[PDB]
Symmetry: D2
Subunit: 296 residues, 4 copies
């Protein structure tokens, strides 16, 4: 027995930060949940009860608050990079910092057609996330993503031409409902360190916007041949609009809505072109995944 | 031993309905979760294993789909009334139908500044609900509500002047964060039956809008003296804008955001007027309730 | 507009307490989640921004910890009564205290066939709860319950003889699966105050045990004619074994397990007497309720 | 743009299976949730709308039921291997099958001290899982695990000697509460195919038992120097008791229970050796991970 891999830290650290413009009086809020796990020469904490190598997770928690107090918390890619870099620069024996950040939505309220200076609404459970891995001597690897974006289209979704054998019962369809929870991730080119990350700061919010916009427009306008075909179109467009991204990954559940045959009741017609009332299925659900990169 | 009270039925029935305009091609979707519990001369099903008095919950499920297929599913107040009335009119021994409906949000997508004809987004977990109790010989009682409306204001919330004794540690404040999940219910005047409910149909969507609008504006503009004082203002305004409502009830959690003293670290100032980074508290939470009616 | 009803306090207060026997070294842990809402002459806090009538919810939180420190936290019926009584005795303007307690399971671990002195396991999400309403001049009303007790029987459950009409599709069955999450509540005779509650302390744990035992044995041995018939048998037995209880209420979901016809695949037989593989249904679910009292 | 990676299938497929002994009348139930994702020459389904390469996820669902009907569903390692092998043997273009199975607990009820023939109870949310990856030409890789095993010890947990600097506030302790949700995984040596997996069937249940037993005993008896030190002891013991396992991985959250200083209230002593009432913390939580292998 020997330690082959190990990391530890503090998870689920909720953090809120407010910015107050003294000139305009407008306030802006940010809320996130942070997790920081460290790697390094810490094996002895596991094998010899040597806690001298342990930067207490409680201390990691304090550090998250302190860093948020002295640095911008947005874009999350930047905050994560600053936070991760701190650990590998401050502690000689810590060689990797793994920072995950989940950003919660606090959209400014519009009252009587005017943006309110200090009132916000949680419009959607959709999240914007980042996974920032700061590895000593190996720069900063960043994976940005949007998740929990739940959508549905009532038509212009099809699924036919699939393999049919003795295990097949699914009927081909040229008009079905398509609903999913979008989980899209774009992996950035490795960054040499904080300076390079900072040099590209504007691209983070811009690329998130691009990803979300491409996602929504493609979902709404593509007369889908399958979840697979539609998600690929999203990925290729995103790669074409941001050269600093290496790959785009999508994980999409096919949240099924089943037709309900009611012909047994007074010959009521509710299937095919007559389908109006459907039964949303909680489970099971198809799960379609794809990682798209640039061709050589 | 004897049955003092009893009701049974089907809960968590997911229902989706689509409307397709053949003229414009625009489609509109509706999704809800329905629960129908019946009351009546059914005691023998419990005491003598007499299932002859039982309208199978599976049949109640079928009835929900059938009713949704042959009637409008909006406003929910109407659908609930139609569904409830069906049970007490169809079965002589059933004297009460309790219908609960949770409406899920499927907001039409805007693509390139134009509303899309058949694509929707789940913008928020906020729900619009109704509890419709159809009692034979006693009309229809309806309670409408909005829930899961999560908001936050970064200032203009205060709390001072409260009772202070040996159990008190809370410091008075003239500037704090206020965040809550709004659960507001407006109880309608009893309706004599389906005809009367139908005669007031336009008022349901209109009153829901009023309640939501009053909620948001009051929350955003009231320099709150307490959750209690602010919620009362919301209630009185709603009662003043809809004569057919008898009471307005609010249940609001005070989702605390605690200041974080960081002065122990290099004299960092993060409290009082210097407070920027806060610790959102998952629990516990204050819970403030109030039912407001008209004065005599 | 006027306040018709109002209550406020602190919800979701997590509390852990440990007892350490200095003689044996054996430690025993207790964990619960408490909610205390107060009623009284507090209308002005809502109508006039008068916080002088408000016992801060933060103070209510402190009081919960203090009371747990100076009193037994079990049985929950007792702790709830002590806590509720404190508020109506300490504050002249507070006339009702509503205490809800959810008790979490921390069962002592058995290691090598011997009970461990200080290690515990969360065996099941099943909870033991109490709702204690202390009303000045009207004694103490207590509702005890067990919830989250999930069970399943693979046979000896039937359902036939139910009403059949044009809305019915359910096939009669003489052998089906029955699974539910038991929520059982026994309402105690009103107690005049703390002294009377204390005089009956042993009966609380004893009655909870009786309720759980009757529930499990009846569920396992009754060749069920319906959920209704089986739950009634449980209720009548509990009432017969504890004279101080006035009513017993059950709320049981019928968590359906559907047969899967596989005859389309190589004539595979998986229905009726050949049924082996089933599809558990997440939703919808039947919901059966009954409140049983003593006959006159 | 080109597909770099892709897999798809059906997730959250609930499955129940019952075994009925005609001789004794004793019935035994099994319930699980299955996910099967396939890999292979399917890129064209994403890039050219070529569904001919798609084995419908609905068909994958049917296959799960069929396989469960014609094969043992336990141990899960075996069922997963059989199911995964089916896909790569049946479809020439499918080269990998990824099978995840979550086993739910249905423990036989004991009534009056006797095991009941057909009644079960969900004793704990603890799960037994497997991840079976069947790769054509590369055998079968299996990762077995237990998760959701929630435990707590009230003493014999310590944490001192950790790094202390300007970010540290945590006080050293020689007596604290330790609670966690155990997630333990043991990775098996690669198996050449179904025959080899079948040849080791008895070892699966035996090793799961060993892992659970070592986990519970070590947690209860180790006067813990840290979560790190205690989890390592568990891992090394498991590796020493099953030669066919290559690594053991633990992921443990440190679910904090904070002391509550009540000295501000009548000098009440509730800290240090006087600590009785604690505040369980929902978040944040430490997260400690380690993968232990055999030394060379
Ligand atoms: O067991 C522990 N391990 C840790 O790494 C730690 N950090 N703070 N408290 C802790 N406890
Ligand atoms: O036990 C049952 N009670 C019911 O009321 C019912 N309705 N459908 N199936 C049922 N099973
Ligand atoms: O708005 C508030 N109402 C209350 O009753 C209270 N108690 N503590 N803090 C509070 N804030
Ligand atoms: O879009 C889809 N992709 C699939 O792979 C599939 N399988 N069944 N239905 C499906 N729909
Ligand atoms: K370093
Ligand atoms: K699918
Ligand atoms: K009737
Ligand atoms: K409060
Ligand atoms: K009083
Ligand atoms: K039912
Ligand atoms: K193959
Ligand atoms: K920790």
């Amino acid at each position: 027995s020997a330690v082959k891999a190990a990391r530890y830290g503090k998870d689920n650290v909720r953090v809120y930060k407010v910015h107050k413009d003294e000139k305009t009086g407008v306030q802006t809020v940010y809320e996130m949940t942070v997790c920081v796990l460290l790697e390094g020469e810490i094996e002895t904490s596991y094998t010899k009860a040597d806690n001298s190598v342990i930067v207490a997770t409680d201390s990691i928690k304090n550090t998250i608050y302190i860093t948020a107090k002295q640095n911008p918390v947005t874009p999350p890619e930047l905050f994560g990079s600053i936070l991760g870099t701190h650990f590998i620069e401050k502690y000689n024996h810590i060689h990797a910092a793994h920072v995950n950040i989940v950003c919660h939505r606090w959209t400014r309220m519009d009252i009587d057609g005017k943006p309110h200076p200090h009132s916000f609404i949680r419009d959607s459970e959709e999240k914007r996330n980042v996974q920032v891995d700061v590895v000593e001597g190996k720069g900063i690897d960043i994976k940005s993503s949007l998740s929990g974006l739940t959508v549905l289209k009532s038509t212009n979704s099809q699924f036919w031409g699939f393999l049919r054998d003795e295990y097949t019962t699914l009927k081909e369809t040229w008009d079905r409902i398509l609903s999913t929870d979008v989980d899209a991730t774009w992996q950035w080119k490795n960054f040499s360190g904080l300076q390079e990350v900072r040099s590209h700061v504007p691209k983070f919010d811009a690329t998130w916007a691009t990803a979300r916009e491409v996602t929504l427009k493609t979902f709404a306008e593509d007369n889908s041949a399958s979840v697979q075909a539609t998600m690929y179109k999203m990925a290729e467009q995103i790669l074409a609009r941001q050269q600093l991204i290496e790959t785009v990954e999508y994980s999409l559940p096919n949240k099924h809505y089943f037709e309900i045959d009611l012909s047994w009741h007074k010959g009521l017609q509710n299937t095919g072109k007559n389908a109006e009332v459907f039964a949303p299925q909680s489970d099971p659900n198809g799960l379609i995944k794809c990682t798209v990169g640039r061709s050589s």
